[PDB]
Amino acid sequence: MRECISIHVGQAGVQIGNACWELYCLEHGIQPDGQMPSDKTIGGGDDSFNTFFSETGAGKHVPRAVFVDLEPTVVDEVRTGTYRQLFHPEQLITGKEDAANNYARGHYTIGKEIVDLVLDRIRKLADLCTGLQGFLIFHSFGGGTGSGFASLLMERLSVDYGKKSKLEFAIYPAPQVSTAVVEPYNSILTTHTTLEHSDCAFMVDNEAIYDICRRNLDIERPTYTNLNRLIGQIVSSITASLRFDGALNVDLTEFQTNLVPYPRIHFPLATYAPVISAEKAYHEQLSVAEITNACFEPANQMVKCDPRHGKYMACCMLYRGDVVPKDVNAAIATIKTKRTIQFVDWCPTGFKVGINYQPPTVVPGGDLAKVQRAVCMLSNTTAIAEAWARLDHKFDLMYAKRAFVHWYVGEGMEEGEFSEAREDLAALEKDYEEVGVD
Amino acid sequence: MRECISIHVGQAGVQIGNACWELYCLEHGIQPDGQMPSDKTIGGGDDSFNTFFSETGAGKHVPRAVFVDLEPTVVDEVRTGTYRQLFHPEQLITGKEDAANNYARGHYTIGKEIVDLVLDRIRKLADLCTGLQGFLIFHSFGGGTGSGFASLLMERLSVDYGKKSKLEFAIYPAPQVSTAVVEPYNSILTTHTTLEHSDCAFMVDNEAIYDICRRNLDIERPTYTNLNRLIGQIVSSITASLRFDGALNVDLTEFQTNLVPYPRIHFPLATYAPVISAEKAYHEQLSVAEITNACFEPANQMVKCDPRHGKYMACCMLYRGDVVPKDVNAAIATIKTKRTIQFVDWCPTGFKVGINYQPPTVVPGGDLAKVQRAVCMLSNTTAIAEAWARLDHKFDLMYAKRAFVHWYVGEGMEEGEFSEAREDLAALEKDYEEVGVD
Amino acid sequence: LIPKAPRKDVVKMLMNDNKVLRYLAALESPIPEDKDRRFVFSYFLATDMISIFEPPVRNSGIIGGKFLGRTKVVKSFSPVDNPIYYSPSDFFIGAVIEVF
Amino acid sequence: MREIVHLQAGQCGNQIGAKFWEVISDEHGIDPTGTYHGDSDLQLERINVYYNEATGGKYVPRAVLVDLEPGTMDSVRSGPFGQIFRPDNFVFGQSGAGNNWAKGHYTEGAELVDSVLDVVRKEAESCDCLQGFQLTHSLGGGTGSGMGTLLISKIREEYPDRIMNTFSVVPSPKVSDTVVEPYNATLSVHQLVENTDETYCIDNEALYDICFRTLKLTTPTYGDLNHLVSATMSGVTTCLRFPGQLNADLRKLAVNMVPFPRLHFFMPGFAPLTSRGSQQYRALTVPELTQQMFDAKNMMAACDPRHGRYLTVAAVFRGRMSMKEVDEQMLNVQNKNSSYFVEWIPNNVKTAVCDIPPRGLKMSATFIGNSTAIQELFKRISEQFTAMFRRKAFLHWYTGEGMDEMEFTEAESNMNDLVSEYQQYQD
Amino acid sequence: IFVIAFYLSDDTISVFEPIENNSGNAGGMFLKRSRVKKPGQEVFKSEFSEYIKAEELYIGATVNINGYLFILLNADEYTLNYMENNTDKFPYSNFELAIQKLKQEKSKSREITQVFAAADYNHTKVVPYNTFRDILMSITMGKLIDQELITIARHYRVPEIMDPDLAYLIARAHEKFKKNIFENFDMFIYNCVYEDREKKGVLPTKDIRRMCKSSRLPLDDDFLDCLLSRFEDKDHQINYEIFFSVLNWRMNPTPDLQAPPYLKEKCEDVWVGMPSPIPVKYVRYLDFLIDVYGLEDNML
């Protein structure tokens, strides 16, 4: 009907998945045991859960997700959480060996003998489903293992199906922070392998997330609980269109068909304006005009790219909760009149607006307050070229000194890909300025 | 009416007889003491139990089975166990000396002076029998005793009764696991002596049962408590149509007429689809579509033969529980249209469906599930000739060197029969080849 | 880590050599025909060593001779950790003995 | 019913008969006196495989002792269980052994074989149906060999349809004490192999090496060695008396083990022998069981099979097992050393699983495998026999007793035929 | 008399019949385990039609099975037991409600007294069930239903729970020993009365049983358990001397066995009538009379 399959590959995807499904169960009112209260919504798998959970004759809402993990520690922990009876046993595919930060170790030595099992899972989901709109793949680029095995699974799913969308989130490598030094290598390898197969790859950065945290959450020492909670609420917002109803509606297929301009370039950015705390929402007040202004304030976006150093071309606004369309269209018109912003010629129309009436929900004991109006903002602009500029004048030095290539070649790799990736990236940036200019 | 006679020849037959009978007594509520308290299911000895019991003037359900063995150890342990009081006293025929893995030891030295007693017992059962559909005989090829004795009994009952039915189930020796280098000898002897009287014989493998047990049932240290309860479930599944009623039914005569294409070749394979443990049944989903897909999954089978190395000519569905014809036909049509299966052009249809409403039943201290939809798989293919090539080349070198032949010549064997065996096998070989040819 | 041999007492096993003691013994028999199997003790003050013997009895039946060679019978009052061998300091008229 | 009657021959047939019977009695809870103290229902049920049952609950061991010097018989008599033995079976002669195979085979036995045959057929009639008899003797030991050769020779025709299981101690290659031992061995082996079906080969040196290795006790008695060998034999005996999945039959083992008419000589090995601290330092897991189980050092029969390969193997295990672990260990051992077995018969291994544990420790096992591991033994005896015969020393005694060397020639001929057959089959 | 089986797992009421001897049924099963219409609905329907509940299968009831009027009289003990265990949907079996029902009437106290008095003539301290049900229906004006009368009989039953004594068991023992040629206990009992090893009084039975097994005493282990039960105490250390003296057969008569027929069964001949077999056989007044109003007599 209207459903998507969730895949989480990794170290990098386990905690965010934990948070997001906790929010899902909380908001639909699932008890972490799995069933409903005396209210009558258990059925033939067709009610609001029919999009996310496979509640079957057993009466338990079963998530339609698979986690695959190379290092069994964290997956044992997640099974030793509380929602274990909720989750499906062999949808929790665990291994015994890490990919050890090596792109080619992940992609070649260990991955191939796991793709059979993961394919078996996904096909036994593909038989039961009927709508199969697409997948939600969670991984990273600064991942020790979320890189290579993820690339391989992407390749197999692309070659078997080219008839469904492919949505990717990513915690992007930090621009100036690098926990790993194999980060640039395996990251660019992932990028150049995935460019010709990815439908919509989106990014977000931990440093800017923290910057928001101590800016307006009034949290100078947040945590993962908080970071993952924020990202989970973001994805909840983007799936609200599927779950609830509304006046005018858009779908992820519309997202793809209406945000990417050309071939190749499909990496936009996202934001959520009303990030405030209990007392803040208490004796303050939000409204459409200032949520627009805040969501387009240059710092509020979660990547360090200055819009005045770039030029806008596409924007999709998702408002959720109560709102009238008058102020919406009026405020976006005023922003059109704004003189600090920059629109390229190609897009006299560039605003895809989508409304859902249902208010966003809170998590108990968490940080975010009650929300009356909320917005997810998805913008694409030329600005992000500087990040790849950074990555290339980083990687060039390591290649000049042929650093750390011994590991990869000893486990059996050759210069070909290492050379190719640099001009793949170079083609990417050159296209960036070619389209940015007029 | 609808009643059958069971023969349990050998060390192995008699135990799985005990296990399956311990099954049988439960689903009609028969107690380990063999008498119910005050309630009534008794009558003219004529009601659902009458298929396997005949509760006579003493209100005791009497098995319609016979247990013949050579070494008195296990017949003693079952004469001292929990069910000796219900088992009929002198039916349980015991010997004093083994068969020593020699075919001619059971076929020339011991089996002669016991066949009289056993035939007398089966005739004084056949008199009180009325319908007498047939005999469920349990032997084993690599039987440390029973092969030779079973050959003699089967041939004599075939020649004296050439109108009633004969069905053979037997644990088949493994492709690579060994308990007897002598096993090829008696295997080929029994084959070339039985292929011209056996109506249909069905082979399964202990390793395969084990592999299932630690892939899906999650049993890392089974025994055949577990696996015998599985095979008992299998036979209960094939006989549920006999026991109960429903929309449309199936019979062993139909099996005889419609599973086997030609004389000689009467060797199908058996499977049970929804093998599943407690928690998987509890909080997952089952339905006709996925259970059919699973039962046609190529690794679920009890003998290692690759269907892409084979080709199908017959299939029998035994749908028990709550299943309905619409989804039955939809699933089978989808399976037909799927291209992995490669049916021969002989039979444009290759399917025989059978229905029963009554769900299968669990057993205390067991592993099976509260399954509402079960399906027994009985399919005949062409993948199996690889195994007979396997056995003949496993045999040829060892005969060419003639190991242990001194034993057989000492007990009174010559070599004409051993010679004849391999051209019988090659006959079956070229027969499978030719029927495959098209 | 590495074992070593135990210690023996030259004082015990050389001073009082073959100092022997004798006693008469009666038993309880299942068979009523064995009421007077007069048996003989023999003790050696060398290793607290015990042996038991049967004299031939004229024309009364039972063959005589030896029932058991010299033995280090561990005392029934000697636990598995403590190997007493029925220290002769306990023997007295009408004593209580259980061996094998 | 199937049952076994025991024969103990020679002054070490005494050794082992004493130790073996006392071990079984302790296993079965029969007191040294005989009054059965029933504590294991199964062994009470199946005691008849070894024992008749007398009044009040004592059980004669159907075993017969043969010797020549009454002192040894009286010593074993004096043993803690000579009372549970038989004044009936206490047949014996008056002569001195002279440690002389020639005299034993022709002079001394000529007035003892009659009576012992009477006794053995008396017991055979007394019981219903033997599987056969186990005979414990020595091949190097003089009078044990002299008796046993003639005894088996006659019983061969007496019953051509039963199990003539034989147990023999191999002379220490380093020393035989008795210097005519090679002569006795060459004399005996001919009739031994000619008449028997299954023979156990054991040597004292390897048991001493075990005592150093895991017993580590440094003060051994031949009695401790007998304790070991009694457990060894009990291992293969437990099958018949015990329930559960297991092919118990010695004839089963024979037809699963013996490839050719004239292959009879087999070599034992056994399972956990617990060291100084291994009691609390050893985890009893099928991996480690098989690990020690199939090891060169723990082998104690003749000489390292490192030089040769294994023709065929068989293994029985006492305890609560399942098939998957023995199965998977079989896979691993086959895939580990694909060469170390003969290609002559793939999958040359047999398994058996006694449900009954021993009394005190959880898991045990018995190993028995036929290999090309007797070539060095009889080639050794060949060089010794040739070197000593080339000058025909120590031979006037035997001339006086009534011998000649043509039988020596034919004996060494048959033995070299055995060498050639082994070499041509395996190599 | 028809088997109507209520399957609580599917709400289906199976109708089966047993063959009788020389009569006109030759039938059996009548209704394949089927949910069946309430006999109070239409052919034209708009709302969810109803079906037979478990609320109305009370003892002594009327019912229709799609046409045929069935009447229901008797019940089995296991059904009774499950009846009283959980009474939320089964208030019938709760006898205290009948206690209040009969406690409502007061004037009839002395009248019940004399009626029951004249019912008896010898004061034998029992009473026939037929008379009991008749007099109770009378005092209820024919307003009581069968079930609660059954339950109250069950409660204030006469107690008649007995088992076979040692007489049979010892007689069978004697005759079995006669069969087993080992009749002479001279071979066993004298051996035992020696083999008592460390004894002053009595001995653990774990010794007698084990020595029996050792000596191969001819008997089945089931009778071994039975007699060991019949001769035991709190510690299971009986006087073995008298144990053996009595198990010996130096003085005994010799009975023998009847058939294991099916007469006192409930598809064969006992009474198969309106007082079908019999629920509780006999019952006594005075307890129930006191519980109702038995005042101004004895303590009350």
Ligand SMILES: Nc1nc2c(ncn2[C@@H]2O[C@H](COP(=O)(O)OP(=O)(O)OP(=O)(O)O)[C@@H](O)[C@H]2O)c(=O)[nH]1
């Ligand atoms: N995606 C994600 N990344 C995080 C989180 N916390 C820290 N990180 C960053 O994400 C990276 C995780 O990458 P990896 O450690 O390579 O993950 P992996 O390749 O799947 O496997 P491992 O190295 O074994 O854990 C780290 O380098 C961190 O810098 C988080 O919650 N989620």
Ligand SMILES: Nc1nc2c(ncn2[C@@H]2O[C@H](COP(=O)(O)OP(=O)(O)OP(=O)(O)O)[C@@H](O)[C@H]2O)c(=O)[nH]1
């Ligand atoms: N049916 C059954 N099979 C068993 C049992 N225990 C082991 N097995 C199986 O029995 C098969 C071998 O039977 P055989 O060795 O030929 O036994 P036999 O020839 O009838 O006679 P025995 O000497 O008593 O073993 C193996 O494939 C095992 O899987 C049991 O209790 N029941």
Ligand SMILES: Nc1nc2c(ncn2[C@@H]2O[C@H](COP(=O)(O)OP(=O)(O)OP(=O)(O)O)[C@@H](O)[C@H]2O)c(=O)[nH]1
């Ligand atoms: N119980 C016991 N047996 C021993 C002992 N030491 C050695 N044996 C061996 O047992 C062997 C066999 O003895 P027998 O079979 O009785 O030999 P025999 O024909 O009677 O004549 P001999 O060889 O001279 O003893 C001897 O040759 C010894 O080597 C021991 O210390 N105790």
